[PDB]
Amino acid sequence: YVKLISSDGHEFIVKREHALTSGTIKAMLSGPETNEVNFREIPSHVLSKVCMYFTYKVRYTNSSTEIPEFPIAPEIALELLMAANFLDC
Amino acid sequence: MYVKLISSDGHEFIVKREHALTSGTIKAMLSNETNEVNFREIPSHVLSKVCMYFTYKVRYTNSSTEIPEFPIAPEIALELLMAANFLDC
Amino acid sequence: MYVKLISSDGHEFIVKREHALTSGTIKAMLSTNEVNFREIPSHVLSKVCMYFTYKVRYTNSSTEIPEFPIAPEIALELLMAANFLDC
Amino acid sequence: MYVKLISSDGHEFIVKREHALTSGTIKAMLSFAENETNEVNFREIPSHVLSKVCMYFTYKVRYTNSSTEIPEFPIAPEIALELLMAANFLDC
Amino acid sequence: LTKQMNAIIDTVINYKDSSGRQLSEVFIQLPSRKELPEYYELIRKPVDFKKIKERIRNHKYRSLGDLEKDVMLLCHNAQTFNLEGSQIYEDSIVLQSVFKSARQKIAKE
Amino acid sequence: MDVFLMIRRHKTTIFTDAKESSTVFELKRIVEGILKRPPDEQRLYKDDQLLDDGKTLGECGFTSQTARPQAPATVGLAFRADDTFEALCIEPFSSPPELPDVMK
Amino acid sequence: DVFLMIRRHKTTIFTDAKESSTVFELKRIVEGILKRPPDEQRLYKDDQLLDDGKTLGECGFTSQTARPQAPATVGLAFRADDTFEALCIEPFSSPPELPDVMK
Amino acid sequence: MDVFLMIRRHKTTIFTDAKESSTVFELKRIVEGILKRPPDEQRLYKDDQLLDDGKTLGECGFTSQTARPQAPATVGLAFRADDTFEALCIEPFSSPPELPDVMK
Amino acid sequence: PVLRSVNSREPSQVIFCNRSPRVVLPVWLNFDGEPQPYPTLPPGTGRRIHSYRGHLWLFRDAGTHDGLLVNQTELFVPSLNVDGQPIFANITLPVYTLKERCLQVVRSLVKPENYRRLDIVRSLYEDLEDHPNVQKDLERLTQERIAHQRM
Amino acid sequence: VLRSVNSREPSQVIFCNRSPRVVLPVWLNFDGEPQPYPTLPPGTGRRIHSYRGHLWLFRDAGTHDGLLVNQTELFVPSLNVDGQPIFANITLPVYTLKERCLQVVRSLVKPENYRRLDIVRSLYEDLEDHPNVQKDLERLTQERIAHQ
Amino acid sequence: PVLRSVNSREPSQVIFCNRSPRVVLPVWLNFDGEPQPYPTLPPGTGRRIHSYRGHLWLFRDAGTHDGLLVNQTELFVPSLNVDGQPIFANITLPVYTLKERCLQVVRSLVKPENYRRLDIVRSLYEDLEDHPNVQKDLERLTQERIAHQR
Ligand SMILES: Cc1ncsc1-c1ccc([C@H](C)NC(=O)[C@@H]2C[C@@H](O)CN2C(=O)[C@@H](c2cc(O[C@@H](C)CN3CC[C@@H](N4CCN5c6cc(-c7ccccc7O)nnc6NC[C@H]5C4)C3)no2)C(C)C)cc1
Ligand SMILES: Cc1ncsc1-c1ccc([C@H](C)NC(=O)[C@@H]2C[C@@H](O)CN2C(=O)[C@@H](c2cc(O[C@@H](C)CN3CC[C@@H](N4CCN5c6cc(-c7ccccc7O)nnc6NC[C@H]5C4)C3)no2)C(C)C)cc1
């Protein structure tokens, strides 16, 4: 597991492999391994959803049946796009 | 184009001719040709559902898309089975 | 030795001590060769013993075990007795 | 596709071809080498024997390569000797 | 350097876990496409542990950071292809952890 | 996308399909074709709410997954008697017998 | 899972069929072999006629009494015009008296 | 099937999956593995209702269609202090800014 | 054996996609053409499976042994794979006759030993007792292949 | 911890059902997720193609009741010696009288009617707690962490 | 032209099954490897279509021109039908990158003239402006196909 910490200071414990979906996190962890990474400019309502994507990507990559749309509400769209860009994904 | 099926209790069901013909027994009774047929031993809660099947069969026969289960409630199952066999649906 | 289980209707059941001990609740009560069950009738306590016979005999038997039969008529009262006994 | 085995006393036994082939002697007799023969005639095998010889074909075919448990193929004393004779002749 | 590359790469291969089993036994040589076509379609850069010693015998790797970049690539290629919690998945997680401790002992001591 | 309907007035029940995009008026015309009564003598209800001739069945609430062929959505029908429309009255279908003991 | 000897006169057919399969399906198998259509064949279990609609199971044939080594006997009769041929299964050759060696 | 979860106590949020068929107890064991506190010191809640260690996530209400990977179902966590358990307290995530007029 | 797999030694990657509401039993016909049960597909799942070119498959309701469809037909035989791309087997409900469908429901509600107790005609009782069956259906499918290869 | 191991070495096996029940063979996949396989009727046996190190488990297809294979709960085929097949003998365990009674009651009474039986509340919960591969897998893990 | 249909003259019946939420634009590559737009599949719809063996197809969101997948891959080429049994093309959403997915949503909510009003990096603004495109993607697929593997 790995600990991602939002600006407001929420802690998110997610599987290491799930997190590594983010090239930028891969860099921060792979370059001195530690367990924590701190995002001073990403709020919780965003970093929460960024994790939810890791869950989604990990689960539905290489899925034979059918894949469901990864939903993004208008209210969060812009800040998520920012966060998404800053992280590789 | 339309045909009238009349239940024992005396409900009238107006359904497309071709939808009704899905029933050999009805095909026989209609094959000039009449507009009404009366079922003295089939109640409405049954003949209603028999029509719903015509709707279903006509629509989903030859469909490339996944077909959905034609539902039958326990309470209706036996009388429907009886009606079904008489009709040849 | 042997041990005496007595049903509500007052039937006596003499079964080997080790057979009876298969029941945690009997194990507790004998820890004395008698125990009285005011709420267990004979047709039930009789079958409870038959289980002891079965369990003792077939536990650690390699080739094949036969299903321990329970008739519908007795099923509920046996389930009750079973839970009380811990067998 | 089936085959007809005919006993001395002239009973006809129709059994699957593959069932019959379990007998080397029969396989030999069946396999003019342009096409297949349905009948084979056993001059010296009575019915009560040839009947049981078939029952063996049924048994052998069914239980060969069956995994958990095979039952013993019963032979009554009354038939044992004549069957042994027939058995050896047939090669089954 | 080539000797250290041989040490780092040979320590990761020779490495046995605490039940005595060698982990690299599957990672030694890749499967033929004829054998397993799904792996090749899924994996961009099929590389194994011989393909890496071959490079090292050719000294294709320049620094110890270029040898590491392609040991992480196969160990990550394995993780992508395999099921999470598979035998092969968690050993490519250990082979990355035994390569990162093997390079840290040879390159600075 | 298609919607499957039961248009029911009293003891009459009409089974027909129509597009989500088709209109309440077009439906009145289908009824006219069958029951020989013009769209100006008809009122069509979804449950207890009146449907405006100009709205699409879609906008009224009839959809792909509430108007399936085997679960047709019910449109109520009322005819005009001189000055006033009759009450919307849909005489219910016959009740099924209590479950035989084997299925209970 | 049921093993059968279907016998009419001096002819005996050795064959299997499912407990769940029907007397009619059996007539069809006979049709396939002896080239005689299903409706003129009459099949007996002992001395009782079998209805085309009943499963071999419900006629009385079970896996435990119709084993491959001890096949159950279904009697067969054909139809000539209006009349029914009598259930005639001419018995097999008889075994010699038990030799004194085996007593 | 698979159920996707956020187990949250205070400002801690654990992202993990389990099976519909798996139990509230094994979920406590996953938490034990991370937060280093045994299942007898943990209370797990679905909304405000306490979850029995013996029930399957399925039976608790976590279906595949309410515990999707991108919409994880939230299990609340409480730890034991001596004789009493702390209140279930899940500090909320940061609020998003009022919807910009550009997106209206 | 009209309906049977053909030994090919050329692999064909396939995707079994269960788009029925039922648990699906994939049934591979072997070279002799004997049905071989394979692991079940839960409703709404899809799995990549290794089969060979010319191999013949069939699908059924693992519980009831009811007939299903694959790519709106009864048998599936993987095409030769092109460019590594996997072939797709879309498994769905057919449009059952109202009768057969009713039988299914009655069969699902009443224990088989009680079919006898239902106040219906014996013919219906026979139909109830005639459980659907891969082999019966295979026999029918053969005669339906010799009927479009007669003409 | 409890999962098959990708092996590449075939191990032919004989599943022999010597229980009175229809048996559901359950193969643990590499990730260790139970995979239902085709059922064995009572008193049947089949040769099945499996691989070395593959972990199997057997159960009553109808009730999901626990069965035993070679007097234990898990079966893992050893490497074949000289091509001869390994044998998996599937049998009833000796169920507790309680668990056995539950089995019978569960089989006679619809789950919505467990509430109508004049029994203790605890028993209602026990009745409702139907046996389950996953619950049992969790238990088997803790029984292997307790042997370490 | 590496990526192109092949003149077969052997018909191949196919079933286009749209299991994406999106309206699907089927795109047939011509023999000169030129994308050719075809009639749209509504969401959750399936149609039997007449195509030929070796013909190469590609699918996309008719609106956004976003990339979709057919049978877990980017390109669909019908095999020759066995026994008249139709081939099946199962069209699905791919796992979009969170970024690309976000772009999709922002693009769908904000008028292109207002991309300038978002307090984001200029590079992100260019990414917002850079609508997805069949031709760009075809060029990429060729270099990935000219590499014998991927
Ligand atoms: C009728 C009836 N009744 C009651 S039950 C039943 C019944 C039972 C069974 C069946 C069917 C026919 N049988 C089964 O279901 C059986 C049962 C159970 O035992 C599992 N199984 C299966 O079929 C699984 C299965 C098959 C398989 O075969 C491998 C050896 C093939 N694999 C590719 C070759 C090697 N792999 C080679 C690359 N290797 C990898 C290497 C790397 C790698 C290495 C170096 C550097 C980088 C790398 O990435 N990475 N990944 C690799 N992955 C594969 C690994 C090994 C093995 N194995 O399992 C199937 C179902 C999943 C029918 C009826
Ligand atoms: C409702 C709905 N919803 C969602 S989608 C949809 C839908 C889907 C499909 C359809 C309709 C019914 N179907 C289609 O549109 C299908 C689909 C797709 O598969 C292509 N196609 C077509 O119809 C093309 C088509 C192709 C072709 O094959 C030839 C036999 C037809 N013609 C004879 C002869 C040939 N030419 C071949 C070169 N040839 C020359 C070659 C050369 C040459 C070649 C190599 C090297 C050197 C050379 O010099 N030189 N000169 C040539 N001159 C002659 C030329 C002849 C073409 N049949 O149809 C059509 C569109 C092109 C509807 C709805």
Look at ligand 1, atom 54, and give the residue with the nearest C-alpha.
J6
Distance, CA of H45 to CA of B28 (rounded, Å) = 64
At H97, which CATH number?
3.10.20.90
Whose tokens are 């498959």? That residue is I57
Distance, CA of A6 to CA of A44 (rounded, Å) = 5
J17, J69 in Cβ contact below 8 A? Answer: no
The domain of H31 spans: 2-103
Q: Which residues of D11-40 are buried (b: 16+ CB within 10 A; e: fewer)?
A: bbbbbbeebbbbbeebeeebeeeeeeeeeb
Structure tokens at H16: 């993990």
In C1-87, where do the E strands start and end?
2-6, 12-16, 34-36
I16: three-class secondary structure by DSSP:
strand
**Residue A1 forms part of a structural domain:** no
Quote the DSSP letter at residue H11. Answer: T
Q: What contacts D72, CB < 8 A, 6 or more positions away? A: none
- Three-state DSSP string of chain J: CCCCCCCCCEEEEEEEECCCCCEEEEEECCCCCEEECCCECCCCEEEEEEECCCEEEEEECCCCCECEECCECCECCCCCCCCCCEEEEEECCCCCHHHHHHHHHHHHCCHHHHHHCCCCHHHHHHHHCCCCHHHHHHHHHHHHHCCC
Closest by Cα among H50, H48, H30, H28 to H40: H28
Closest by Cα among D55, J12, H1 to G16: D55
Distance, CA of A39 to CA of A25 (rounded, Å) = 10
Output Rg (C-alpha) for chain A, integer angstroms.
13
Residue numbers in A near I48 (CB within 8 A):
64
Measured from CB, residues less than 6 Å from any atom of ligand 2 are: K 7, 9, 16, 26, 28, 38-39, 41, 47, 49-52, 55
Give the H or E element holding residue A81.
helix A74-86
Look at ligand 1, atom 44, and give the residue with the nearest C-alpha.
E27
Distance, CA of A45 to CA of A47 (rounded, Å) = 6
Question: Which of B46, B55, B77 lies nearest to residue F69, judging by beta carbons?
Answer: B55
Dihedral angle at the C-alpha atoms of D36, D41, D45, D50, nearest 10 degrees? Answer: 50
Helix, strand, coil shares of chain K as percentages rounded to 5? 25, 30, 45
Q: Is K14 exposed, middle or buried (0-12, 13-18, 19+ CB in 10 A)?
A: buried
Q: Report the residue among K14, K48, K50 best suited for mutation to probe ligand 2: largest number of ligand atoms under 8 A from its CB.
A: K50
> Rounded to the nearest whole angstrom, what is the distance from the C-alpha of residue J52 to the centroid of ligand 1?
10
Residue type, E64: L
Number of residues that this document lists for chain K: 150
Structure tokens at I106: 């009655």
- Of the residues F101, F102, F103, F104, the best mutation for testing chain I's interface (the one with the most I CB atoms within 10 Å of its CB) is F102
K98-109 vs A44-60: helix axis angle to the nearest 10? Answer: 120
> Rounded to the nearest whole angstrom, what is the distance from the C-alpha of residue A59 to the centroid of ligand 1?
21
K31, K57 in Cβ contact below 8 A? Answer: no
The annotation status of E59 as a binding-site residue, yes or no, is: yes
Residue numbers in A near I17 (CB within 8 A):
64-65
Chains B and K form CB pairs within 8 A to the count of 13
**Residue B2 forms part of a structural domain:** no
CA dihedral sign of residues H16, H18, H20, H25: negative
> Rounded to the nearest whole angstrom, what is the distance from the C-alpha of residue K5 to the centroid of ligand 2?
9
Identify the nearest ligand to the CA of K7 by its number. Answer: 2
Helix, strand, coil shares of chain I as percentages rounded to 5? 25, 30, 45
Residue numbers in I near A64 (CB within 8 A):
15, 17, 46-48
Q: Is E97 exposed, middle or buried (0-12, 13-18, 19+ CB in 10 A)?
A: middle
Q: In terms of C-beta distances under 8 Å and separation of at least 24 residues, what long-range contacts does G49-54 make, across chains too?
A: G50/G23, G50/G74, G51/G23, G52/G22, G52/G23, G52/G24, G52/G27, G53/G22, G53/G23, G53/G24, G53/I122, G53/I123, G53/I126, G54/G22, G54/G23
Number of residues that this document lists for chain F: 104
Q: By the CB < 8 Å criterion, does F34 face chain B?
A: yes
Phi-psi label, residue J39: left if phi above 0, alpha if psi -120 to 50, beta otherwise: beta
Quote the DSSP letter at residue K3. Answer: S
Number of residues that this document lists for chain D: 92
Structure tokens at J37: 């396989």
DSSP letters for I24-85:
EEEEEE-SS--EEE-PPBPTT-EEEEEEETT-EEEEEETTT--B-EETTBS-B-PPPP-TTP
- Of the residues F15, F36, F65, F91, the best mutation for testing chain B's interface (the one with the most B CB atoms within 10 Å of its CB) is F15
Residue type, K44: G
Structure tokens at I144: 């339906």
Distance, CA of C5 to CA of K95 (rounded, Å) = 68
Structure tokens at I55: 């191999």
Give the H or E element holding residue D69.
none
Question: Which of C65, C70, C80 lies nearest to residue J92, judging by beta carbons?
Answer: C65
Distance, CA of H10 to CA of I129 (rounded, Å) = 60
**Residue D60 forms part of a structural domain:** yes
Distance, CA of C83 to CA of C73 (rounded, Å) = 18
> Rounded to the nearest whole angstrom, what is the distance from the C-alpha of residue K37 to the centroid of ligand 2?
14
Nearest CA in chain J to H52: J125
Closest by Cα among K87, B66, B89 to I68: B66
Phi-psi label, residue J93: left if phi above 0, alpha if psi -120 to 50, beta otherwise: beta
**Residue C21 forms part of a structural domain:** yes
Taking an 8 Å cut-off on Cβ atoms, the answer to whether J92 and C66 are in contact is yes
Q: Is K11 exposed, middle or buried (0-12, 13-18, 19+ CB in 10 A)?
A: middle
Cα-based distances in Å from H56 to F44, H24, J57, J135, K127: 48, 6, 20, 8, 46
Q: Is K90 exposed, middle or buried (0-12, 13-18, 19+ CB in 10 A)?
A: buried
The domain of B22 spans: 17-86
> Rounded to the nearest whole angstrom, what is the distance from the C-alpha of residue J76 to the centroid of ligand 1?
15
Q: Regarding beta strands F12-19 and B12-16, do their DSSP bridges make them parallel or antiparallel, or are they unpaired?
A: parallel
Closest by Cα among J15, J19, J13 to J38: J15
**Residue B52 forms part of a structural domain:** yes
A18, H17 in Cβ contact below 8 A? Answer: no
User: What are the residue ranges of helices labelled H in chain D?
Assistant: 17-20, 24-30, 47-63, 77-90
K22, K63 in Cβ contact below 8 A? Answer: yes
- Does an interface of 3+ CB pairs under 8 Å exist between F and I? yes
At A47, which CATH number?
3.30.710.10
Cα-based distances in Å from F37 to F41, F47, F74: 6, 21, 19
Maximum Cα–Cα distance across chain C: 39
Nearest CA in chain A to K103: A81
**Residue D9 forms part of a structural domain:** no
The annotation status of E83 as a binding-site residue, yes or no, is: no
Q: By the CB < 8 Å criterion, does A63 face chain I?
A: yes
Output Rg (C-alpha) for chain I, integer angstroms.
17
CA dihedral sign of residues J79, J83, J84, J90: positive
**Residue A46 forms part of a structural domain:** yes
The method recorded for this entry reads X-ray
DSSP letters for F20-88:
SSSBHHHHHHHHHHHH---GGGEEEEETTEEPPTTSBHHHHT--TTTSBTTBPEEEEEEEEETTEEPP-
Structure tokens at G81: 């015009």
Give the H or E element holding residue A79.
helix A74-86
Whose tokens are 């707690």? That residue is J129
Count of domains observed in chain B: 1
**Residue A2 forms part of a structural domain:** no
Taking an 8 Å cut-off on Cβ atoms, the answer to whether G20 and I131 are in contact is yes
- Does an interface of 3+ CB pairs under 8 Å exist between H and J? yes
Count of domains observed in chain H: 1
